[PDB]
């Protein structure tokens, strides 16, 4: 292998998905130079789970998966194993034995708009919490009572998605943050993604 993994295409994308419809890219058969991620002046969060960031270029994996989406700053804490909240329960769920890294940065200057950017949505109601790496993009009316909703919003009948409506004057906790989750997948199969030191 001599092709580099396309980390810049993930981190430097113009468009990011809503967290309820989170995006996933599969990265395979490439040399991964994680050094692009070191000492970023943009990253407000850089945590790894099960491996240490310093050792990333010495590791090999079967596949790497890059999930990306937008949430608010207050919700970045939920993008980790063992968390609870609207995002972890109904939108994007990591497993208790997660092996990967979570990176996030403020995107107020890209994803806010005076008057509100309502393109970013999150699921607010669900009959049950998501399993790890499950994506729910249903728009079925949430039935909160015994009365069927028959597909119409009403009393005890709620549309399940809600918009962030990001505005640049919002406080930091409410500002958009772009998030990238890199999952390191190790199967009983030859490694296709390796650091430059391996």
């Amino acid at each position, epitope marked *: 292998i001599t*092709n*580099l993994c*396309p980390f*810049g*295409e993930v981190f*430097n*994308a*113009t*468009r990011f998905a809503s967290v309820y419809a989170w995006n996933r*890219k599969r990265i395979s058969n490439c040399v991964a130079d994680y050094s692009v991620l070191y000492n970023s002046a943009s990253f407000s969060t850089f945590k790894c789970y099960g491996v240490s960031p310093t050792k990333l270029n010495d590791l090999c994996f079967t596949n790497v998966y890059a999930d990306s989406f937008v949430i608010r700053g207050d919700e970045v804490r939920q993008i980790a194993p063992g968390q609870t909240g609207n995002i972890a329960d109904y939108n994007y769920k990591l497993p208790d034995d997660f092996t990967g890294c979570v990176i996030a940065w403020n995107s107020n*200057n*890209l994803d806010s*708009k005076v008057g509100g950017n309502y393109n970013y949505l999150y699921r607010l109601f669900r009959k049950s919490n998501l399993k790890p790496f499950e994506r729910d993009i249903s728009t079925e009316i949430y039935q909160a009572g015994s009365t069927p909703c028959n597909g119409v919003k009403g009393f005890n009948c709620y549309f399940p998605l809600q918009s962030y409506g990001f505005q640049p004057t919002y406080g930091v906790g409410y500002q958009p943050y772009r998030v990238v989750v890199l999952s390191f997948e190790l199967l009983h199969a030859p490694a296709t993604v390796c650091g430059p030191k391996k």
Partner: antibody
Amino acid sequence: QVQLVQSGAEVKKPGASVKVSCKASGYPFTSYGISWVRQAPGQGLEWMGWISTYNGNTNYAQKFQGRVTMTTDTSTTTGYMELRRLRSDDTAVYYCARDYTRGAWFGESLIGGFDNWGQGTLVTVSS
Amino acid sequence: EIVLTQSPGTLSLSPGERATLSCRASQTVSSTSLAWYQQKPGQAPRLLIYGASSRATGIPDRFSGSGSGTDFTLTISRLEPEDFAVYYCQQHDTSLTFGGGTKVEIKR
């Protein structure tokens, strides 16, 4: 160290075809697409198209949809732009450039521009 | 097509003055996807600004990008002699297009 060196100048009659080459060096060739832009004498910049060095995906400007063909050779880290059925007003300088607007692997839009440009290739189309 | 209109075509200023160059898009352009290029006579264009406000490598501090929606601006805080050139805006929110360019000439 990043350097794009374009082929030499060309003279063509109407209806002939031209192939301009673009040798890239000093960066990972297959991580960036190559974009092509042209500039007629005394006029503005005009986008022609984009090609992925990784999987050969292309995106052409509607104005040249049926006349242009972009290709790459990995071993020689070279891009190519072929423009066909040449008209008089195809006379211009043709630039290749390293692209950071559309991803090589996934073909999705990137925060960036054309960050490195070749010296250009004059193509004169005249009877 | 998203058409970028740059006005005026020729901007005449003295060295040391501030320069603000306008790029107006025919419909809203995502800030992630608007760039500014410089071009001197007989030279290839050079990337100045990407992402509406981010500076490209080796571009001095006096160059600044701002704007949103349909109105974008390239500011040169203090014109040096080397800055009198043509400037093009560029969008790739929808397909890709260039502005017509603005020339900054020495006012005399």
